[PDB]
Amino acid sequence: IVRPVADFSPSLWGDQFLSFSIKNQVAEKYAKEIEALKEQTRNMLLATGMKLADTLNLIDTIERLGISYHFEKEIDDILDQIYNQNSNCNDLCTSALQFRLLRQHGFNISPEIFSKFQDENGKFKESLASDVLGLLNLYEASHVRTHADDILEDALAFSTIHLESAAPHLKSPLREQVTHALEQCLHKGVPRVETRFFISSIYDKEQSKNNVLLRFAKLDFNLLQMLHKQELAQVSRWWKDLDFVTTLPYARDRVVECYFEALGVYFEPQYSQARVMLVKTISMISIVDDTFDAYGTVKELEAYTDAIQRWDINEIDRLPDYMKISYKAILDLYKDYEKELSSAGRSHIVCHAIERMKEVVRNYNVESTWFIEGYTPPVSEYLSNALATTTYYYLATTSYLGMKSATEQDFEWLSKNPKILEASVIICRVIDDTATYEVEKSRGQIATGIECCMRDYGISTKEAMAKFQNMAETAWKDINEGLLRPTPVSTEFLTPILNLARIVEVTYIHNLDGYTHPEKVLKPHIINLLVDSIKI
Ligand SMILES: C/C=C(\C)CC/C=C(\C)CCC=C(C)C
Ligand SMILES: [Mg+2]
Ligand SMILES: [Mg+2]
Incomplete structure (x- = not known):
């Protein structure tokens, strides 16, 4: 044979x-x-007494740093409470992040939080195109859609076009974070891989x-x-x-x-x-x-x-x-x-x-x-x-x-x-x-x-x-x-x-x-x- x-x-x-x-x-x-x-x-x-934006940014950072597996209860309680307060916040950056973190953790937050950022047809107001951080967070959030989230049908294309336009003039390491996100979004990446990149290439190099x-x-x-x-x-x-x-x-x-x-x-x-x-x-x-x-x-x-x-x-x-x-x-x-x-x-x-x-x-x-x-x-x-x-x-x-x-x-x-x-x-x-x-x-x-x-x-x-x-x-x-x-x-x-x-x-x-x-x-x-x- x-x-x-x-x-x-x-x-x-x-x-x-x-x-x-x-x-x-x-x-x-x-x-x-x-x-x-x-x-x-x-x-x-x-x-x-932390503000909403600072609490979400804290949790997001701990998660990207790859250490959130130590605080599954604390993170859960804080997002749960955020979920039930259905607070209003008029900032694309904080709204998109609130949406992603809640959805990734199972809380069925409503996509109507995004309507205040859209015109009639449910298209994102292009005046937002100069809000790099807002765009970045909308881009990550756009990858956790369900079938009930067609308000966001446009978010990927809108955030992508304008992140590409902005990226070459952004300061470091934000520039490298945006460039990486366009190649590999957070939600669909392997967690250790994304965590190694975040620690070494981004956070380690953050002034703040x-x-x-x-x-x-x-x-x-x-x-x-x-x-x-x-x-x-x-x-x-x-x-x-x-x-x-x-x-x-x-x-x-x-x-x-x-x-x-x-x-x-x-x-x-x-x-x-x-x-x-x-x-x-x-x-x-x-x-x-x-x-x-x-x-x-x-x-x-x-x-x-x-x-x-x-x-x-x-x-x-x-x-x-x-x-x-x-x-x-x-x-x-x-x-x-x-x-x-x-x-x-x-x-x-x-x-x-x-x-x-x-x-x-x-x-x-x-x-x-x-x-x-x-x-x-x-x-x-x-x-x-x-x-x-x-x-x-x-x-x-x-x-x-x-x-x-x-x-x-x-x-x-x-x-x-x-x-x-x-x-x-x-x-x-x-x-x-x-x-x-x-x-x-x-x-x-x-x-x-x-x-x-x-x-x-x-x-x-x-x-x-x-x-x-x-x-x-x-x-x-x-x-x-x-x-x-x-x-x-x-x-x-x-x-x-x-x-x-x-x-x-x-x-x-x-x-x-x-x-x-x-x-x-x-x-x-x-x-x-x-x-x-x-x-x-
Ligand atoms: C996408 C195609 C495959 C996955 C082939 C079937 C899986 C294996 C032969 C195991 C190795 C690859 C993994 C992604 C686990
Ligand atoms: Mg085969
Ligand atoms: Mg075969």
Whole structure:
């Protein structure tokens, strides 16, 4: 049997992550000062008689500095109270910020706060075009719209045109903040990435900066980075022992990239265990994808699918040699999962993640069949299979495994394919097909998402690409709507789904597969998040 040619580039990273020894003295020094700075920060938030604009600017700063995970109660109480006071404020800057912070935290504040800034048609008064800060905040707020927010239909285009016009003459670092926002808005960015940029390129360079807050953010970012470095070391050891880089040389070698993805789903230390489990699944399912996609044969892929469906060690002998590697590693990864959760009595929940992995594999197989036959389904039929081949129902289920508070009713909710999860899956799927379109019409892909769409509707490649853009916009409005209270589960179980959508946007920025081709988009992030500390 003849297999296809290996074209995946090797891991950029070698072994620079394989061993990290925490300087335990440094850590304890950071932690001790952090405790002091934490209380100073708290007392800032609990301070009385602050004006509205100063309270929102404080919370916004703490959030961009990446330290708001320390003050979830205090921030919640202050925004709640702001929500219920429905105060009037005649300042675009403060109104737009009030809107974004409330919406991001689930409070369904009314978009009518923006009507006083519009003319008749509900178009923004162009007299506002010289209010750079107001424009900046309207621009960030315009990314948290729901379907009930068509007052804001114009805010993105209006704020964008005038930020571009103003940017070249703005002072620093405001200029760099605006330029960055136009390339990457806050709401759809990965939080650690946005936080590293804010600390280093913006706040550190602010004439007005608060020194307590800056030192806090620098120390906290560097202290957490040490934890992530440990995790990546241990995950890097795990990957090494499996040695798929030699035994399965057809597969992408990307455990570091998988770690970055999992660090986007959550970065806080309380999710250390969840983070490590999640990375391992991403790795493994990336292997199964390379097998179906650029190596295995029709007959082989079917025995793989059946074996996965059956999910029993007895089945290895039914599969060719190399597939036995994949198969046993998968089954043992899940025995390990069951062991990690024993102590706490949560071993049973592994089966949810398993059922979603079986589903992924089935749909890989269907997609193979469609390719071998040259079948070009209608869009509806394409999606009923290709949504799950994003792995996003699978990764979202996985993300809960390590979260100690995840209950069985939380997994029940996720199994019913709730609206927020589906939106996140749709974003992943259409970003994929827009990016990997051409590159797969080269390898003779006949059932690419875009193709199905053109043939189904009778429309050119462009119009089809714009139709996928619309499903993504619809999907982001659905995610934003899914964060509004009352939430169907704790917000703690909603954020991973939202972060899954962020991860996809950040990895395919500028329409290029950054996981397979990490050097251009993911490499600078991995360096800023996992190599270089923030110079204090
Ligand atoms: C956008 C396309 C994909 C995501 C492919 C399916 C996912 C993987 C093969 C895991 C690595 C990439 C992540 C963004 C988690
Ligand atoms: Mg694939
Ligand atoms: Mg494929």
